[PDB]
Amino acid sequence: RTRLLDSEIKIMKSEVLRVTHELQAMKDKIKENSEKIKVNKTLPYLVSNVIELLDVKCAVIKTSTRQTYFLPVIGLVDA
């Protein structure tokens, strides 16, 4: 009659963790994808050429303006 009430209060102990981890998901996700909507309202999305890939997860950019860019973290795609 005592351990069951302990699990009842531990359900709320885990529900506070649910609240905070769903906050670290959702409220941070609003930050991330509001920044990404801020990257999703632009002038173009400049077409380019990805030629190789690196690991010391990378992606290279060679545009139709013949400009060879690079980014080390790729962002909203996968390899």
Site for another protein, rule CB under 8 A: 2-4, 6-22, 24-26, 28-29, 31-32, 35-36, 51-52, 54, 60, 62, 65-73, 75-76
How far is residue 22's CA from residue 28's CA, in Å, rounded to a whole number?
Answer: 9
- Please state the closest distance from residue 62 (CB atom) to another protein, in A: 7
Region class of 48: left (phi > 0), else alpha (psi between -120 and 50), else beta: beta
- Comparing CB distances to another protein, the nearer of 25 and 79 is 25
Closest CB 30 distance from another protein, rounded Å? 10
Alpha helical stretches, state H, the chain: 3-38
